Design a protein around this ligand. Structure first.
Ligand SMILES: *[C@@H]1O[C@H](CO)[C@@H](O[C@@H]2O[C@H](CO)[C@@H](O)[C@H](O)[C@H]2NC(C)=O)[C@H](O)[C@H]1NC(C)=O
Ligand SMILES: *[C@@H]1O[C@H](CO)[C@@H](O[C@@H]2O[C@H](CO)[C@@H](O)[C@H](O)[C@H]2NC(C)=O)[C@H](O)[C@H]1NC(C)=O
Ligand SMILES: *[C@@H]1O[C@H](CO)[C@@H](O[C@@H]2O[C@H](CO)[C@@H](O)[C@H](O)[C@H]2NC(C)=O)[C@H](O)[C@H]1NC(C)=O
Ligand SMILES: *[C@@H]1O[C@H](CO)[C@@H](O[C@@H]2O[C@H](CO)[C@@H](O)[C@H](O)[C@H]2NC(C)=O)[C@H](O)[C@H]1NC(C)=O
Ligand SMILES: *[C@@H]1O[C@H](CO)[C@@H](O[C@@H]2O[C@H](CO)[C@@H](O)[C@H](O)[C@H]2NC(C)=O)[C@H](O)[C@H]1NC(C)=O
Ligand SMILES: *[C@@H]1O[C@H](CO)[C@@H](O[C@@H]2O[C@H](CO)[C@@H](O)[C@H](O)[C@H]2NC(C)=O)[C@H](O)[C@H]1NC(C)=O
Ligand SMILES: *[C@@H]1O[C@H](CO)[C@@H](O[C@@H]2O[C@H](CO)[C@@H](O)[C@H](O)[C@H]2NC(C)=O)[C@H](O)[C@H]1NC(C)=O
Ligand SMILES: *[C@@H]1O[C@H](CO)[C@@H](O[C@@H]2O[C@H](CO)[C@@H](O)[C@H](O)[C@H]2NC(C)=O)[C@H](O)[C@H]1NC(C)=O
Ligand SMILES: *[C@@H]1O[C@H](CO)[C@@H](O[C@@H]2O[C@H](CO)[C@@H](O)[C@H](O)[C@H]2NC(C)=O)[C@H](O)[C@H]1NC(C)=O
Ligand SMILES: *[C@@H]1O[C@H](CO)[C@@H](O[C@@H]2O[C@H](CO)[C@@H](O)[C@H](O)[C@H]2NC(C)=O)[C@H](O)[C@H]1NC(C)=O
Ligand SMILES: *[C@@H]1O[C@H](CO)[C@@H](O[C@@H]2O[C@H](CO)[C@@H](O)[C@H](O)[C@H]2NC(C)=O)[C@H](O)[C@H]1NC(C)=O
Ligand SMILES: *[C@@H]1O[C@H](CO)[C@@H](O[C@@H]2O[C@H](CO)[C@@H](O)[C@H](O)[C@H]2NC(C)=O)[C@H](O)[C@H]1NC(C)=O
Ligand SMILES: CC(=O)N[C@@H]1[C@@H](O)[C@H](O)[C@@H](CO)O[C@H]1O
Ligand SMILES: CC(=O)N[C@@H]1[C@@H](O)[C@H](O)[C@@H](CO)O[C@H]1O
Ligand SMILES: *[C@@H]1O[C@H](CO)[C@@H](O)[C@H](O)[C@H]1NC(C)=O
Ligand SMILES: *[C@@H]1O[C@H](CO)[C@@H](O)[C@H](O)[C@H]1NC(C)=O
Ligand SMILES: *[C@@H]1O[C@H](CO)[C@@H](O)[C@H](O)[C@H]1NC(C)=O
Ligand SMILES: *[C@@H]1O[C@H](CO)[C@@H](O)[C@H](O)[C@H]1NC(C)=O
Ligand SMILES: *[C@@H]1O[C@H](CO)[C@@H](O)[C@H](O)[C@H]1NC(C)=O
Ligand SMILES: *[C@@H]1O[C@H](CO)[C@@H](O)[C@H](O)[C@H]1NC(C)=O
Lengths: 165, 203, 420, 99, 50, 49
């Protein structure tokens, strides 16, 4: 059985008949050790991509890198469901999302880069009662702007010139 | 960045076009990316294979470009239908659809042109200076339950008023702004007060 | 057999007869709308070439195709996050419910979040999440919002609509007692406050029975959440097809680059290598195109869900059959793994009873018209009753207005109008 | 219009066509004139050659050399000309002619 | 470098070693005439359509 | 990030610059223990021959 992966101890067991094991969609999942008869599960080692979080060259040049779905042990490091974040410091404070990282974690520039759980808003328990009403005594008259595309550039290419000229 | 959406569309076009032209400098496994050089070095029987190599890649790139252009045109057409609906409803009339014509009780919208789109200036009514009052579903007077004709039964702690639901204008409780249905034994939150009749003093 | 469209009912139409309902069947219909698809990404270099350096030295003479593909998938994922934001992140000042749930007799315990810590969801949300259920250079990005925060958005919207009504969708959440908001929603659907206030106890048992039936229906049938399951299965099947295309020769000797590089001299092994390259490129391009088309469909569905949340949940829609069949009263949002479930509360008249009518009533040669209702007759006496509920209200001058004389109007019926 | 509409009734509107090849007037060639025919017999028919174990590279540059006389000669057999063709060598201009 | 176009008088400045300057999609845009050393801009001829 | 975006300046956000993949380290082969080792040796060391 040829391949690469992390060969961990497994609780699930094959039959004494069966020697190999596949996962759903026909991928190797566990194999019984031929030397000593026990079944070791396989989990291929991490290959998640790496991304860069930046506030912009206008503000600073500091960089925070996210290695997706990789433990920080497998190269300040902050472990997140999205992945391992390096260069950003976790904070217990909550702020509105600035640079979305994922799984509720967002980063921002505050000197350095700080990562946190996004605050969904200000928790406001309405003073509800079965004989209490709130009536406005004024108004605002608010003018907002709503931008909507209606068309694009009317491009037109000719295949002959593009392909042959 | 306020017009970023529009900018996005422009970028999504321009970048695509650039990508297309950048596909003209790709060998695709051919000896070069210039047809004239290939025809000027190789014999046409053997240059045919290289021309095929170029043509296959360029045609695939062109088909991909047209496919993504069609998808972008579909999304832009959806946006244009949305804009036409908003011009028909927000601008040409007053819309009762919530948060369609901006946030708040929409009053009226003003259209403005933009290089490849429209900008709606939504003037909407947002009421904000709140006051709490003690409230009644109904008012008991001579066992009639006196429900409010058009407003809400608010109270200053002590006295009661029939105000409109979006601006505190108290007004006294009279038979003209109040209508009667049944007696005071069915309504859960009935509150006992006096409703004023104008006609009797008018005598 | 030849299908029948239904029962060939023939309404008892007449030029003077009406059917005025005398009761109601307050109901909770259910609607499920997909709002997002699985945020996936593909490493085109790793996908097409594995780890071989020779294929990586190719796929660049093919140009920026990989950049196109990963840009399209990244745009799709960002669009999924935007969809989830538009559907759910529509409310400011995340709200809370009072510790005392005295909502006029109504019972939202099944939709309100429970402290027993299933995430922070509710009973109905738990049932919905129970019902519907890397490798080769393709990964799944986690959604920006986690299910707990989506449930928190849901709870905030539910608390705002329970306590404030539609006010929290315009400005600050003006608190108003429940069964008083619903009376005003009746005012919105035509019937007066009398119906609710005199039927307050009945219109809490009707709603609770409807909620219980929704609970039972969601628990019972596995195909209740068919739309979200279809979305998940479609995404999974597209991914599985993309994976299984790897084990395809595509006109080459093998589907594994190592074997080709082993048993052939590289100058002519190049033919098999780029045959596999073209095959995998075509498979990936097809996957991306179908993902974009399905993402357009999901975006349409998510815009529909956002529009419904704005109009149904945050208001009272006068649009017919938009927020459920019947006269829409108010809606409730619930979260599901990749979608939103609306609990459209609607009013349905039922229990009809026919009377005979008249366009106007002739008194003193003046042709009185009804101010806000219909003229009906008990066969002997005439009454002015509202158009969606039987309530006699004997005819007076207060609820009728005069428009001339009893000559032009066709269906004039002679009668008397009382004078207060 | 009616040939591309595959019909004889055309109705109103606008209909398109294909390449607008504006034919370029005449043909211009701007090869540099060194005014020095390149002595190419320096390499082919000259004194004794080297050995394969120590092969020597010769250079011809800053000159106007013609391959047509080479190809037309029947003595010069065994041509392959990888990457180009003998008939099209003439119009090509080069700089690094490693012999 | 074969091809058709209009050879306008160029205004860009060249390194005394640079021969021909390209643009995006590596299309020959400017060229030095080997004799009477100067810069010329190659611009594609009218290819609109009818 | 500048190189992949092909722009000298970059804006606030997150950009997937490249891909990380763990390198395999050593290699292992496991086969059924010991052997079915033949009585071949008795042929080479037989007494009655
Ligand atoms: C409603 O709000 C407006 C402002 O939004 C109030 O008008 C302000 O009144 C103060 C003093 O009365 C002035 O100093 C401000 O200049 C006013 N602002 C504007 C924009 O006119 C208004 O008084 C409020 N309504 C009530 C009933 O008090
Ligand atoms: C209840 O609301 C009424 C409405 O104004 C208030 O009654 C009047 O208050 C003014 C002073 O602002 C007095 O001059 C009048 O004599 C009051 N009219 C009465 C008592 O009939 C009253 O102040 C409010 N009660 C509160 C705020 O507790
Ligand atoms: C509002 O509901 C509460 C209980 O459901 C009631 O009012 C409270 O009643 C308790 C005891 O029953 C008292 O201790 C509180 O002081 C009361 N508070 C208020 C504000 O009344 C009552 O059933 C309901 N009130 C109305 C007006 O319907
Ligand atoms: C109306 O005000 C009175 C004041 O106590 C209350 O109802 C009265 O109850 C007594 C017996 O407890 C009866 O004899 C009176 O006839 C009632 N008054 C009426 C019917 O007007 C009660 O506070 C109020 N009624 C409500 C709120 O329904
Ligand atoms: C209107 O319909 C409701 C049911 O939709 C009726 O309520 C039922 O009434 C019967 C007899 O009064 C009871 O036995 C049931 O338990 C009631 N059901 C519920 C859910 O409350 C109601 O009576 C009808 N109204 C009229 C005037 O007939
Ligand atoms: C609202 O409905 C729920 C479920 O129908 C009720 O929860 C029940 O609570 C009582 C005791 O508190 C018990 O019957 C069970 O523990 C719960 N489930 C069921 C199915 O009964 C809840 O009590 C209702 N709300 C009110 C105010 O009664
Ligand atoms: C239709 O309804 C009217 C209104 O109730 C009925 O007229 C009343 O009938 C009852 C007994 O049948 C009398 O006690 C009332 O005095 C009548 N009201 C009057 C005369 O104003 C009428 O009988 C009904 N018609 C039917 C049932 O066919
Ligand atoms: C509804 O239609 C009936 C049917 O024509 C009308 O009743 C007729 O009335 C005229 C006099 O008004 C009589 O001469 C006819 O004999 C009646 N027809 C029948 C079949 O009896 C009635 O007037 C119409 N009502 C309205 C409001 O349009
Ligand atoms: C109103 O009642 C009378 C029958 O009693 C009818 O209308 C009368 O018509 C005559 C002339 O045709 C007039 O002189 C009377 O003044 C009318 N009476 C009125 C207006 O009360 C007719 O049947 C009835 N009107 C209807 C049914 O529309
Ligand atoms: C070989 O040297 C001669 C110079 O004398 C040239 O080629 C000769 O060409 C004439 C007629 O064109 C022939 O009759 C001779 O036989 C050729 N000489 C040969 C073949 O050796 C030319 O300079 C040289 N040939 C090359 C460079 O191909
Ligand atoms: C491989 O060899 C080992 C020992 O030579 C065998 O495992 C031993 O089993 C006994 C009893 O089951 C244990 O007390 C020893 O500790 C084990 N040895 C080791 C090194 O763990 C094993 O069975 C052999 N594999 C086979 C025969 O397939
Ligand atoms: C059984 O035969 C084997 C194979 O020949 C013998 O193994 C070797 O035998 C030679 C000669 O007898 C010795 O010199 C070697 O040292 C042996 N090798 C080992 C690893 O022991 C084996 O000795 C024979 N058994 C006997 C003779 O009893
Ligand atoms: C003007 C006024 O009375 N406002 C109060 C507000 O201060 C309070 O926080 C809440 C009721 O508890 O709403 C109301
Ligand atoms: C439900 C109900 O009471 N319907 C009545 C019934 O008396 C009548 O027969 C029917 C038409 O046939 O329409 C009306
Ligand atoms: C971004 O740069 C501009 C000038 O290019 C500057 O005016 C602006 O303040 C900058 N934004 C910051 C520093 O946040
Ligand atoms: C690293 O991966 C996961 C993520 O924290 C963790 O559970 C696992 O134990 C770690 N692997 C180690 C310590 O080898
Ligand atoms: C706050 O942050 C510190 C350091 O990051 C951490 O140890 C702690 O658990 C966090 N929470 C609280 C409540 O202190
Ligand atoms: C308004 O809210 C405050 C806050 O507790 C309360 O003290 C006051 O009694 C309320 N007013 C009315 C009229 O209910
Ligand atoms: C209701 O309609 C039926 C027709 O099926 C009719 O017979 C009946 O008389 C109508 N009811 C009244 C009160 O007229
Ligand atoms: C080469 O061409 C140049 C063009 O400017 C010319 O001046 C020169 O005389 C030519 N050399 C000759 C004819 O030997």
């Amino acid at each position: 059985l040829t391949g690469t992966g992390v060969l961990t101890e497994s609780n699930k067991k094959f039959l004494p008949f069966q020697q190999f094991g596949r996962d759903i969609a026909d991928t190797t999942d566990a194999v019984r050790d031929p030397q000593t008869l026990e079944i070791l599960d396989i989990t291929p080692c991490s290959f998640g991509g790496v991304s860069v979080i930046t506030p912009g060259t206008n503000t600073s040049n500091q960089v925070a890198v996210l290695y997706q779905d990789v433990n920080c042990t497998e190269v300040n490091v902050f472990q997140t469901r999205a992945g391992c974040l390096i260069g950003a410091e976790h904070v217990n404070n909550s702020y509105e999302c600035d640079i979305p990282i994922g799984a509720g974690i967002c980063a921002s520039y505050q000197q350095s880069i700080i990562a946190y759980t996004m605050s969904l808003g200000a928790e406001n328990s309405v003073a509800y009662s079965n004989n209490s009403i709130a009536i406005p005594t004024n108004f605002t008259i608010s003018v907002t702007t709503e931008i909507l595309p209606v068309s694009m550039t009317k491009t037109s290419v000719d295949c002959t010139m593009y392909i042959c000229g | 960045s306020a017009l970023g959406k529009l900018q996005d569309v422009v970028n999504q076009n321009a970048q695509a076009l650039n990508t297309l032209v950048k596909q003209l400098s790709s060998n695709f496994g051919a000896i070069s990316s210039v047809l004239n050089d290939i025809l000027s070095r190789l014999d046409p029987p053997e240059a045919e294979v290289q021309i095929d190599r170029l043509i296959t890649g360029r045609l695939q790139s062109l088909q991909t470009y047209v496919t993504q252009q069609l998808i972008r045109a579909a999304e832009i057409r959806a946006s244009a239908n949305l804009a036409a609906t908003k011009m028909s409803e927000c601008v040409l009339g007053q819309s009762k659809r919530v948060d369609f014509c901006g946030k708040g009780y929409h009053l009226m919208s003003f259209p403005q042109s933009a290089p490849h789109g429209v900008v709606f200036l939504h003037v909407t009514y947002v009421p904000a200076q709140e006051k709490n009052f003690t409230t009644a579903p109904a008012i008991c007077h001579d066992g009639k339950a006196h429900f409010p004709r058009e407003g809400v039964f608010v109270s200053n702690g002590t006295h009661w008023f029939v105000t409109q639901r979006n601006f505190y204008e108290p007004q006294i409780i009279t038979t003209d702004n109040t209508f009667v249905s049944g007696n005071c034994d069915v309504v859960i939150g009935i509150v006992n007060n006096t409703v004023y009749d104008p006609l009797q003093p008018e005598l | 057999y030849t299908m029948s469209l239904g029962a060939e009912n023939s309404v008892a139409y007449s030029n003077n007869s009406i059917a005025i309902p005398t009761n109601f069947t307050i109901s909770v219909t259910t609607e499920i709308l997909p709002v997002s698809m699985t945020k996936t990404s593909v490493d085109c270099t790793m996908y097409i070439c594995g780890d071989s350096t020779e294929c990586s030295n190719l796929l660049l003479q093919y140009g920026s195709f990989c950049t196109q593909l990963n840009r399209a998938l990244t745009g799709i994922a960002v669009e999924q996050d935007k969809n989830t934001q538009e559907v759910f992140a529509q409310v400011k000042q995340i709200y809370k419910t009072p510790p005392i749930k005295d909502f006029g007799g109504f019972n939202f315990s099944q939709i309100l979040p429970d402290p027993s810590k299933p995430s922070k969801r509710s009973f109905i949300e738990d049932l919905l999440f129970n019902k519907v259920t890397k490798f080769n250079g393709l990964t799944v990005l986690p959604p920006l919002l986690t299910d707990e925060m989506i449930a928190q958005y849901t709870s905030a919207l539910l608390a705002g609509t329970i306590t404030s009504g539609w006010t929290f969708g315009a400005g600050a959440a003006l608190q108003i007692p429940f069964a008083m908001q619903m009376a005003y929603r009746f005012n919105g659907i035509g019937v007066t406050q009398n119906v609710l206030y005199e039927n307050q106890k009945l219109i809490a048992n009707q709603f609770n029975s409807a909620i219980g039936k929704i609970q039972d229906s969601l628990s019972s049938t596995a195909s209740a959440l068919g739309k979200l399951q279809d979305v998940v299965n479609q995404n999974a099947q597209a991914l599985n097809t993309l994976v299984k295309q790897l084990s395809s020769n595509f006109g080459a000797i093998s589907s594994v680059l190592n074997d080709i590089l082993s048993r052939l001299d590289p100058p002519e092994a190049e033919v098999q290598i780029d045959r596999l390259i073209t095959g995998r490129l075509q498979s990936l391009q097809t996957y991306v195109t179908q993902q974009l088309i399905r993402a357009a469909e999901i975006r349409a569905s998510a815009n529909l869900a956002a529009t419904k949340m704005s109009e149904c949940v945050l208001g009272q829609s006068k649009r017919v059959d938009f927020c459920g069949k019947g006269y829409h009263l108010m809606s409730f949002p619930q979260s599901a793994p990749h979608g939103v479930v609306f609990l459209h509360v609607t009013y349905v008249p039922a229990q009809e009873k026919n009377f005979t009518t008249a366009p106007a009533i002739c008194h003193d040669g003046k042709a009185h018209f009804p101010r806000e209702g219909v003229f009906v007759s008990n066969g002997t006496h005439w009454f002015v009753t509202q158009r969606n509920f039987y309530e006699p209200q004997i005819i007076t001058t207060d609820n009728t207005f005069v428009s001339g004389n009893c000559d032009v109007v066709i269906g004039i019926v002679n009668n008397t109008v009382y004078d207060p | 219009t009616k040939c591309t509409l595959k019909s004889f009734t055309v109705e109103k509107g606008i209909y398109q066509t294909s390449n607008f090849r504006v034919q370029p007037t005449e043909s211009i060639v701007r090869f540099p004139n060194i005014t020095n025919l390149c002595p190419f017999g320096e390499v082919f028919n000259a004194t004794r050659f080297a050995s394969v174990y120590a092969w020597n590279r010769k250079r011809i540059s800053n000159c106007v050399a013609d391959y047509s006389v080479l190809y037309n000669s029947a003595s010069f057999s065994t041509f392959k000309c990888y990457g180009v063709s003998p008939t099209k060598l003439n119009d090509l201009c080069f700089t690094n002619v490693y012999a």
